[PDB]
Design a protein around this ligand. Structure first.
Ligand code: QGQ
Length: 126
């Protein structure tokens, strides 16, 4: 079975709208989302349709860009580090689950290269 997805709404979590979080949406997420290799990462892993019955046995902190996009658009975060951590969790899960050198690993690596280039110029907090 699939687990419930990660949380994207929690009214008692305190929230901020900040220039670093705006950059994470307008620059980081949008750059990765439009990439030709984004599609596997645009929603939670569907272990049923993809026939991955061991995925959620191995991966206990699932994360994906559909979840991150919702978190950014719905102002779920307090700070940029929370969102950066979500991207890094997504990449790590892919590398942990998959056989080294598989297509999905090359896809994650291409997105991660762009992620790192954009994070390198995360603006100073205003
Ligand atoms: C090309 C492709 C797509 C997918 S989508 C499912 C997926 C993701 C995302 N991370 O690990 C797996 C497995 N899997 C393999 N190969």
């Amino acid at each position: 079975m699939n687990p419930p997805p990660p949380e994207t709404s929690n009214p008692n979590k305190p929230k901020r709208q900040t220039n670093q979080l705006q950059y994470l949406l307008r620059v980081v997420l949008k750059t990765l989302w439009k990439h030709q290799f984004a599609w596997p990462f645009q929603q939670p892993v569907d272990a049923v349709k993809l026939n991955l019955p061991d995925y959620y046995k191995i991966i206990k902190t699932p994360m994906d860009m559909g979840t991150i996009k919702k978190r950014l658009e719905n102002n779920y975060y307090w700070n940029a580090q929370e969102c950066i951590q979500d991207f890094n969790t997504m990449f790590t899960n892919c590398y942990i689950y998959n056989k080294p050198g598989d297509d999905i690993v090359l896809m994650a690596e291409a997105l991660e290269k762009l992620f790192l280039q954009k994070i390198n110029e995360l603006p100073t907090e205003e």
